[PDB]
RNA sequence: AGAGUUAAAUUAUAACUAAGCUGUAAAAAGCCCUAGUUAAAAUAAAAUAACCCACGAAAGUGACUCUAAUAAUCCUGACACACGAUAGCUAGGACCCAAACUGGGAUUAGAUACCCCACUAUGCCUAGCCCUAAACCCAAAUAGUUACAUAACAAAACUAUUCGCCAGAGUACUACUCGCAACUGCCUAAAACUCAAAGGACUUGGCGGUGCUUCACAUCCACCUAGAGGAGCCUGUUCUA
């Protein structure tokens, strides 16, 4: 993509390889944040398409009394909500 | 069709029930017939057991009715095969010796054999090119070749015929003259064959 | 390697048909245009000894386009040319039209038989113009 | 015409059958598109007639390439589903 | 589309040419 | 490549035919093809090689094109 | 080897001048194109020209060739098993790939990006 | 731009051989001084290579060889200068093949057309004109940038320096002027009058004697049966009364 040029180290042989030092400082910010909400006791949910890793991802959420969604995932979901999923809802307080 | 698609045909014939034990694929085949619960129509009134039913003789006999007269259709194809019998025997007993081991006295062969005799090889359908119907060379299948003969003894033997002249002994003489190929009916089986020859450049046209 | 196709005009090839040189053999000329068809079978002295044309069999102004008439034409020039005796046959078909392949295969159902193909078929290197394309 | 004959364009029928080698000749005339030259040349085309059908060949020319590339490369990807009813 | 346009010059220039012939 | 050299020239061309192949057989640079091309033509007007058929005696030659006629 | 699209189309860059006008955009599709179904020539054509030359020769009087009709009616019966055949021969495809509705889905897998 | 050369094909014209040969959806006319084969100059046009993308300012240029040869230490620039596809004009040659015109033949209600067959101006050369094209890549030249940014569609968006061009639509590649080897021409190019529009791109429909697949199950075709149209009569319309 172009939006990773920043966050890129550089390419080796043709491969791509991302700057670990950013990924740490980026990955605290992100993990200091998911706790912060779920301290605050509010919706997490994980979501992925991908197949490979489809169970774990589910099975992870689980045990944390975290919500996952890894499937088709229909239209107007979040925007259409009260439609969707029932008369009134809460909605994820964060999307990971 | 108040028989659903469920419902397949029935096997009429004796000799496949009573003697089974020697067939192996056969014997799995109608195990799976039955076993299958398969619901099976019931036989027809025409469709007999009978030693005697000859099914080309009762598709001759059908196509000759007129209404809905079984009756009379079997009526005159009765006394088509008696007038055919005793015409034969007529020409058995004022004939010679080595005549007397040629003549068949048979009149069901001699039916079988006339209409093997009257059937064509190829015929006629028409093909639209460029605006014009060319008449162009089909062969055909065997179920359709025994209609043709069988629809044109018929036609022929109706049709032409002065009033005064009973059915089943005109269709007897147009019997035993197509057996000898001399008659008419083999005339139009000709007519056809010599048209096919006449147009045969035009199959190209026939694409399948 | 066996039948390696062009035998060479030097005599390194020996393969004889009726005891006779590739040279020796028969040619016969077919020429299939998109109306006709004929055949004419030469010597290899280049003395004609058979001729048929789909008209020369007595089909007419369009039917002796066909296939069917190009087997036709080639059983009969085969009967004149099986007359005067030639066994073998080398083919040479000219232009490309409906009766190619018809007349090859009649020229061996009509009990003449073959041993080669070759194609010469007019390619112009652009020489003469051809005539205008039809709608217009 | 001031060639020495016979050694163009000939194939000769191997175990004497006809049709074999004549599908053969074919496939030599076709291969070197002398048969798309034949049927062209019957009538005329007219030069920018002409460079028209070379532009719409070579086009369609680049396009199925690609695609028969992309194609036989997710091939692979063809192979039974691991992952099904995750 | 455009070729409406040139279907009015052509005519009009048609209609012209024959014109002047006559004249 | 020379235009003397017909046996290199007759590699690059249809034995039934005389015909040239394209790159996509020959699978030459842009320059050695054309310089192929060019050789040819020349071989031919001059007349060191024909035209319309591969001389039978470089038939028996090694092959070097991608093309299967016989199948 | 595909064909250098390099300085063939008409664009603004371009000093030199076209050589493909394509008539649609030059992009792989998602879909593949249906299949082409063959058509029919006419079937038996030989046998029934056999039998012709034998009843020109012959009056017409069937009984004297057995064998050029007995031919043509085989000709018949395996031109129409070639027909039952070939319209229950549909897993053909193209024997050796696979039937367009699997180079469809599988495309889709695997979509091209005009986009972004 | 010269000068020289020819491989395929075709044609004269002979030698044989067969009566046909040509031609379409189907035919006809046409030709048998025809056709197949074997020989063979001129003229004309340059398979494959080319799935290449070069050379020229553009038009244009792709058979072969040799001669001459592709402006500018490189910004823009005209009504000036020099060129400019086809067709056309003038004079002289050429003439294989093609072919407006025209004459036959079909088709058609008609067919001055599409299809067929001949044959001509003309395409070809040498010299002189004419100066027009959907001469369009509809995208000006020369330096740049990919920042900002999607009317639509198409070939994504823009600076800077220039010249050229555009003020509703017709009227109008027209009328008058001016100039040109043109004198049914080219170039330049209005107004009266009329209208409230005229235009570009798109959107759903509908439609298509477009293309592709798949069907029709009393159903188009092929197929089977029995009838209507004819006759007498019944009975309903329509006309006369
Ligand atoms: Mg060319
Ligand atoms: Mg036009
Ligand atoms: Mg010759
Ligand atoms: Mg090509
Ligand atoms: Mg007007
Ligand atoms: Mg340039
Ligand atoms: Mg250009
Ligand atoms: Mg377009
Ligand atoms: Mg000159
Ligand atoms: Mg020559
Ligand atoms: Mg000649
Ligand atoms: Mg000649
Ligand atoms: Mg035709
Ligand atoms: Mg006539
Ligand atoms: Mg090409
Ligand atoms: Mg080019
Ligand atoms: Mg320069
Ligand atoms: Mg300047
Ligand atoms: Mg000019
Ligand atoms: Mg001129
Ligand atoms: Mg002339
Ligand atoms: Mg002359
Ligand atoms: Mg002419
Ligand atoms: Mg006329
Ligand atoms: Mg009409
Ligand atoms: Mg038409
Ligand atoms: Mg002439
Ligand atoms: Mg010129
Ligand atoms: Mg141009
Ligand atoms: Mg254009
Ligand atoms: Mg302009
Ligand atoms: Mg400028
Ligand atoms: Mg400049
Ligand atoms: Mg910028
Ligand atoms: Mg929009
Ligand atoms: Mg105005
Ligand atoms: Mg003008
Ligand atoms: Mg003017
Ligand atoms: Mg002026
Ligand atoms: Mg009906
Ligand atoms: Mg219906
Ligand atoms: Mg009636
Ligand atoms: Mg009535
Ligand atoms: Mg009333
Ligand atoms: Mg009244």
Redesign the pocket.
């Known amino acids: 993509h172009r939006f990773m040029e920043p966050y890129l180290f550089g390419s080796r042989l043709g491969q791509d390889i991302i700057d670990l030092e950013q990924t740490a400082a980026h990955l605290q910010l992100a993990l200091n944040f998911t706790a912060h909400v779920a301290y605050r006791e509010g919706i997490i949910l994980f979501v992925s398409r991908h197949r490979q890793f489809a169970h774990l991802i589910e099975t992870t959420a689980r045990d944390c009394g975290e919500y996952a969604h890894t499937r088709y995932f229909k239209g107007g979901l979040l925007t259409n909500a009260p439609l969707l999923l029932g008369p009134g809802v809460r909605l994820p307080d964060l999307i990971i | 069709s108040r028989y659903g698609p469920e419902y397949k045909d029935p096997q009429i014939d004796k000799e496949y029930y009573r003697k089974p034990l020697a067939e192996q694929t056969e014997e799995e085949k109608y195990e799976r017939d039955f076993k299958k619960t398969q619901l099976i129509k019931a036989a027809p009134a025409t469709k007999t057991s009978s030693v005697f039913e000859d099914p080309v003789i009762s598709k001759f006999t059908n ?1 000759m009715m ?1 209404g809905g007269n079984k009756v009379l259709a079997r009526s005159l194809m009765t006394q088509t095969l008696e007038a055919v019998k005793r015409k034969q025997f007529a020409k058995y007993h004022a004939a010679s010796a080595e005549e007397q081991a040629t003549i068949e006295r048979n009149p069901y062969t001699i039916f079988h054999q006339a209409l093997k005799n009257c059937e064509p090889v190829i ?4 093909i ?6 060319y008449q162009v060379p ?1 062969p055909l299948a065997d179920r ?1 070749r025994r ?2 003969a069988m ?1 044109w003894m018929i ?1 022929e033997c109706r049709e032409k015929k002065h009033r005064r002249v009973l059915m089943p002994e005109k269709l007897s003489q147009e019997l035993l003259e197509a057996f000898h190929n001399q008659g008419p009916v083999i005339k139009r089986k000709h007519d056809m064959h010599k048209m096919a020859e006449a147009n045969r450049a035009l199959a190209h046209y026939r694409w399948w | 390697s066996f039948s390696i196709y062009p035998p060479i005009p030097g005599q390194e090839n020996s393969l004889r048909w009726a005891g006779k040189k590739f040279e020796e053999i028969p ?1 016969a ?1 077919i ?1 299939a ?4 068809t ?3 079978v ?1 010597s290899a002295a ?3 000894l058979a ?1 048929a ?4 069999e ?1 089909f ?6 066909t296939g069917i008439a190009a087997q036709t034409a080639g059983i009969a020039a085969a009967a004149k040319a099986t007359g005067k005796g030639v066994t073998h046959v080398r083919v ?1 078909v ?1 232009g490309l039209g409906p009766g190619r392949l018809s007349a090859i295969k009649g020229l061996t159902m009509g009990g003449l038989e073959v041993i080669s193909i070759t194609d ?1 078929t ?15 | ?3 020495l ?1 016979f050694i163009a364009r000939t194939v000769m029928v191997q175990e004497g059958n006809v049709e074999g080698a004549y599908r053969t000749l074919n496939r030599i005339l076709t291969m ?3 048969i798309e ?1 034949i049927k ?2 019957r009538y ?1 085309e007219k ?1 920018c007639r002409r460079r028209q059908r ?2 719409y ?2 086009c369609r ?2 396009y199925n ?1 690609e695609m028969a590339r992309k194609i036989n490369f997710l091939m692979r990807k063809n192979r039974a589903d691991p992952w099904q009813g995750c | ?6 279907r ?10 024959k014109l ?2 006559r004249t | 490549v020379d ?1 003397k050299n017909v046996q290199l020239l007759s590699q690059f ?2 034995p039934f ?10 699978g ?1 640079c ?1 320059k050695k ?2 310089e ?3 050789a ?3 071989a ?4 060191f090689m ?3 058929y591969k001389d039978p005696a470089y038939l028996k030659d090694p092959k070097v094109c991608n093309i299967k006629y016989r199948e | ?4 699209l ?17 008539n649609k ?1 030059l992009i792989l599709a998602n879909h593949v ?7 029919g020539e006419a079937t038996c054509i030989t046998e029934m020209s056999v039998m012709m030359a034998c009843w020109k020769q012959n009056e017409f009087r069937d009984e004297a060739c057995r064998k050029e009709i007995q031919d043509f009616f085989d000709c018949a019966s395996r031109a129409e098993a070639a027909r039952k055949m070939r ?1 229950i021969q549909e897993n053909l495809g193209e024997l050796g790939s696979l039937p367009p509705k699997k180079l469809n889905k599988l495309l889709h897998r695997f979509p091209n990006k005009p986009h972004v």
């Open positions: 196509m007129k015929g006629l359908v028409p639209l090119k460029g605006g014009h119907f089909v359709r209609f043709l629809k036609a | 040619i000329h020429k245009s998109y109306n006709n004929q055949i004419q030469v280049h003395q004609p001729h044309s789909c008209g020369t007595g007419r102004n369009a039917k002796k386009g040479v000219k010469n007019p390619i112009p290197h652009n020489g003469c113009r051809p005539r205008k394309a039809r709608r217009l | 015409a001031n060639h004959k070197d598109g002398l030259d062209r040349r005329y030069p070379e532009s060949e070579t020319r680049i390439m | 589309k455009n070729i409406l346009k040139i009015r010059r052509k005519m009009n220039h048609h209609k012209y040419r002047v012939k | 235009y061309i249809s035919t005389g015909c040239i192949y394209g790159r996509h057989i020959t030459l842009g093809q054309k192929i091309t060019k040819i033509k020349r031919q007007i001059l007349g024909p035209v319309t | 080897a595909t064909p250098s390099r300085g063939r189309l008409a664009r603004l860059g371009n000093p030199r001048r076209p050589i493909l006008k394509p955009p194109g249906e299949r082409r179904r063959e058509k319209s």
